[PDB]
Each structure stands twice: as C-alpha cells, then as structure tokens.
Write a protein that binds this ligand. Sequence first.
Ligand SMILES: NC(=O)C1=CN([C@@H]2O[C@H](COP(=O)(O)OP(=O)(O)OC[C@H]3O[C@@H](n4cnc5c(N)ncnc54)[C@H](O)[C@@H]3O)[C@@H](O)[C@H]2O)CC=C1
Ligand SMILES: NC(=O)C1=CN([C@@H]2O[C@H](COP(=O)(O)OP(=O)(O)OC[C@H]3O[C@@H](n4cnc5c(N)ncnc54)[C@H](O)[C@@H]3O)[C@@H](O)[C@H]2O)CC=C1
Lengths: 300, 301
Amino acid sequence: MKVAVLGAAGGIGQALALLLKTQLPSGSELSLYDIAPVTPGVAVDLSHIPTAVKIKGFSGEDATPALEGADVVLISAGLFNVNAGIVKNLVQQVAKTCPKACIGIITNPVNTTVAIAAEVLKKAGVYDKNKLFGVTTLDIIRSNTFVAELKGKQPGEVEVPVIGGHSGVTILPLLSQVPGVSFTEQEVADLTKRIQNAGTEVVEAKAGGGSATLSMGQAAARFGLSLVRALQGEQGVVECAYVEGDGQYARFFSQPLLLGKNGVEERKSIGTLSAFEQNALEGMLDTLKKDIALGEEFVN
Amino acid sequence: MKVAVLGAAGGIGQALALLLKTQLPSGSELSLYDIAPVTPGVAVDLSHIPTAVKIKGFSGEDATPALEGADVVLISAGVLFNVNAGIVKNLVQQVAKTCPKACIGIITNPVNTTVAIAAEVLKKAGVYDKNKLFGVTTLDIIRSNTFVAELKGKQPGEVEVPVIGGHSGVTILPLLSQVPGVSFTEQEVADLTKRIQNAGTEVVEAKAGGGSATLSMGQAAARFGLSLVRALQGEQGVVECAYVEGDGQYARFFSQPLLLGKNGVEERKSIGTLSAFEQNALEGMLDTLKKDIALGEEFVN
Ligand SMILES: NC(=O)C1=CN([C@@H]2O[C@H](COP(=O)(O)OP(=O)(O)OC[C@H]3O[C@@H](n4cnc5c(N)ncnc54)[C@H](O)[C@@H]3O)[C@@H](O)[C@H]2O)CC=C1
Ligand SMILES: NC(=O)C1=CN([C@@H]2O[C@H](COP(=O)(O)OP(=O)(O)OC[C@H]3O[C@@H](n4cnc5c(N)ncnc54)[C@H](O)[C@@H]3O)[C@@H](O)[C@H]2O)CC=C1
C-alpha cells in the first residue's frame, strides 16, 4: 500500500501528510511530491514519528519516483488556468507511471478539474472511471459539524450525505436523510446556504490572509484512508465523491459510493429526496454541466 | 479540560492544533492565540472538523481571552535568542496573571534556557509551582523510538526509550540501556546516540532552507499535551520525560521520567541504573546544561 501526495508541501498537503503518516495502516508507504524544494525535508521531519509508515519526499519537475508503485494518488497541488494546467501536468505523469492507482483530485474547482483529469487519462488510454474521484469530503464533514451543533448531537455520530457538485449551488446536502434529525424548511434553506458558503467563513476569519487548509487535510485524510481500507479488501466502506457515473443527472456527479478493491464498487442511489432537495437538484444541473464542459474544453 | 496553544499560527502550532482538535477527549476546549492576524481563522478552519472539541482563535497582544480558564498552556511562539527569550517572558507573564494554576509546556527554543526564564517569571509573579512547568522534550523520545525500532526490527509503536538531561546536542541522553526487551552493542549505542543528539540538524539540512522540524514536533507536543490532560482528569500511570525543576542532583532543571497526576508532576522518577557510556555522557554535559540554565536565570534577573 503506497499513497502519493502531490502538492505535499502546501497548507493542505502538509496537514494531509501529517495525518497519513500517523493514521495509514501499519506497513504502508507514503510518498510526498511538490515542486517546492523543502519537500524532501518535510518527509524527513515526518519520518521521525514512530509509526510503521515509510515516508520519502521528492521535488523537482519529475514526479516519477514518488508515483512509482502508488496505489492512491491525492492531488492537493495549486487562477483557473493555473490550477487547470497543474492538474493536467500532474495527471499526465500519473497516467504514465501509476495508471491503475485511485486518483483523488483536491485541486479546485473540483467540478471542472476532475473532468480535466478524465480527459487526460482518456488521451493516455488508461482511463478507469471507477478510479477517478473529486474529493468533496470537506462538504460532508462541515455538514456533520453544523448539524451536530444545531441538534446537540455528538459530532462524530452525525453523517450527512452530500450529492451534486463541490461549488456553490451544486452542493446539495441531504439533510432529509440524517437519522434522528429533522429540520424545518427555513432551517434547511439557511443551513444549505451555510454549507455552500462555508469556505468564506475561513477566508474572512483569516483576515483575508488564507483559506481552509487544516480541515481539508482532515477531510482528504478521511477520504484517502477510506480508499486504502477498500483497496485492502475491507467491506462496507462508503464515501460520497464526485465521479463519472451513469449520467442520469450529469456526466460527473457526487453520490454515495461503495468502495472496493478496484475503486468504485457500486454507485449507490441518492435515495428519497425532499421537495427542497428535488428542486435544488433540478436547479443546479445546468451549472454542473457547464463546469464539466469547461474542463473538457481546457484539455482541447 | 481547556488547552491553550500560544504561537498557534506557526508551523508547530497549526500541526499541534490540528492534532489536539482531533484527539482531545470529547468535552474539551481548545484556544489558539498568536499575534499573526490569521489566527482566528485557523480556529474557524479547525472548527469545521466534527469532533466534540470547542475551538476559538485570538490575535492582538492580549492573550487573556485564550488563557482564561486554561488547564494546559503550550507555548510554541517564536519570531534570535533575545527576541524569543522576550516572547517567552511576555507570554509566561500573561499566564501567571490569568491562569497561574495551569500546566505550562514550553516548546519555544532553546528549551534548556527558556524553561529557566519561565520559572523566574513565575517566581517573580508569586505563583511558581515547579510541578506544573515543563520543557517539552518529547520529540527526543519519539525520535529515539523510531530509530531504535528501525534498527532492532521492532514495531515502532511498541518501543519506548527514556531520554534524560537537556534538549540540545550533547545534553540529550537516551538511556538505550533501559529499553525493554532490546539490547545494544557498544557501536550501536554510539551510532544511535549521535543520531538522536543531532536529529534536529538532520531535519534542517534536509529542509534545504525551510528550517527546523514542525510536523513531528506537532506530534510530539500533542503526545505530551494529551498525557497532561489524561493525568489532570485522573488517569493513572501516565509517564512522560520532561525538563523540570527537580532535586538538582545534576542541574537545577533536568529532564527525567515523570509520573503525572491531577496537580502536574506527581512523582519525579529515578533515572535508574546507567551504563558506563550513559554515565560518561551525563557527566560530560553538565557544565553545558548549567550554563544554559544560568543564561535564562540572568535574562529575567
Ligand atoms: N477540494 C476542496 O474541498 C478544497 C480544495 N482546495 C484546493 O487545494 C489546493 C491547494 O490549496 P493549499 O494547500 O491551501 O495551497 P498551497 O499554496 O499552500 O499549496 C499548493 C502546493 O501545490 C504545489 N504545487 C504547485 N504546482 C505543483 C506541481 N506542478 N507539482 C507538485 N506540486 C505543485 C505548491 O508548491 C504548493 O506547495 C487549491 O487549489 C485549492 O483550489 C482548497 C480547500 C478546499
Ligand atoms: N521543543 C522542541 O523540540 C522544538 C522546538 N522548536 C521551537 O518552536 C518554536 C516555534 O517554531 P515554529 O513553529 O517552526 O516557528 P514559526 O515561525 O512557524 O511560528 C512561531 C509563531 O509564534 C508566533 N508568535 C510570535 N510572537 C508571538 C507572541 N508574542 N504571542 C503569540 N505568538 C507569537 C508567530 O506569529 C509565529 O506564528 C522555535 O523556537 C523553534 O526553535 C522547533 C522544533 C523542535
């Protein structure tokens, strides 16, 4: 089991690397890759932690040594054209070195960058739609936190499904599907807007001096550790993530996924929707389809 | 329990805050303070993680709202010696005034000196409790565990090396002769001791200008802070090595294994039987360690 983090010297990358060094299964391997020259030393720093996870760091423009043998690749590297070009650059290297890895895209805008990655993998002839994921997990853990606060529940016991996309009106938390929890329509509307805009809470409180890094590291570690468990054969592992699916709603769409040894094992039904959720779903499909087309176009 | 992290926006501080948010017991509180203006948003960032740990962040020059009601204060603030010594003096003055019964863990370097600064500030404030002031040396322990486990084919999480003395260079003394279940050759002792003493330099060189250890120190500080919290809550058998004012047999401040309890140090434990190598290393570093201590006493006095 080898996990590669691309963008590992960044705010998200170092938090993710710290959590993976401490939480990956014993016997795992972790590789860190970033164009920042500090990256080998970030790994050495982390290698002093006494867990059975072997870690090495790499810099320069050739990610090959970090990607060789990787089972999972998490990309937190990173205005649109710059991030789009980074994802294209890195996924080209993934395609050449570890094309059978599960790939988690953190780089925003996820709705678009996942489509960029898919087209790159298709042009290389190695695209496996069961192994490409947009990491939306921050939407889920935010939803869990906010619902638990409002309902006086223990935050670690609340799990909110979140479907759709990962930006603005495309984020659809299914607050109607939370066990033991029931909200008024006004509460749903206000809480949905809060979840959709939650990243701005961080930006504003950082005094305009930064964005969410630590909670995204945690969300990415949750998603990555879920992939690792499933790839090892553990059963019952379910995460929402933005994937190419059956196209019922859009070509790419986030929904609950049963994970397994080949990536997605089953794309699960989004289930029964409230009137609010049905309306919001219909209402954002045009936006989501435009985000997807922007990625396909960028690669041409 | 409430834990306050001073210096929380820095490299160590953010790592430490992330680990505490995720690992402190349900019902805990976490406060972050740093003069960096990002700090309230570091806390809001972490507040989005679904654990039962209330977190708030603070900036400006007044740490009082972060420190009110704190049970544990961890200080990783920094900007060289004179400015960092001044930061420690300033922050411990604020602790002495606001939460004088808290356990205080000094991470800011140089620990051998800055703990002496803290003690003399607390003495001047009239609230010094030598059972509650700690130099956080845990990074030396977890490094030792890692290196020993690798050499001896042991599971890293099953190795625990006592480390005594101070926290810099030749003052770091890993008691490899006391590692349960493991024995070492003389040459293995020499190699491991050198590596453990120079491991901080090891990261500086590898980071190629990015500086000292941050993430592994976050892990070490979280281990230490979590041990203090468990002991304050009444858990039994919680032992950590840390740099404290003790009986002064070797130096005024000295790191040794400590049994922790509800008032901080419950028992300062004997360093035990030392090998010839360890005894020579202990005697050899005492002059250096005493000079480090006197530097910190003089800074305040
Ligand atoms: N999916 C989500 O929910 C979230 C995703 N976010 C995205 O995460 C990305 C990174 O954010 P931060 O960590 O805060 O930014 P950061 O600037 O701290 O780190 C980005 C890192 O990418 C590295 N990088 C750039 N180009 C390359 C390359 N070609 N190869 C390897 N590494 C490279 C760069 O050196 C830097 O260390 C941004 O694009 C954001 O769009 C932000 C937070 C939420
Ligand atoms: N005890 C140990 O084993 C270790 C200790 N280390 C020391 O830890 C300290 C911090 O290191 P880093 O996190 O990398 O440095 P950093 O520069 O990333 O963070 C220091 C932080 O302190 C903040 N700060 C400065 N002044 C104040 C103040 N008056 N009140 C509150 N906050 C303030 C500053 O804004 C900054 O965010 C240094 O002295 C290091 O030498 C480094 C690694 C190991």
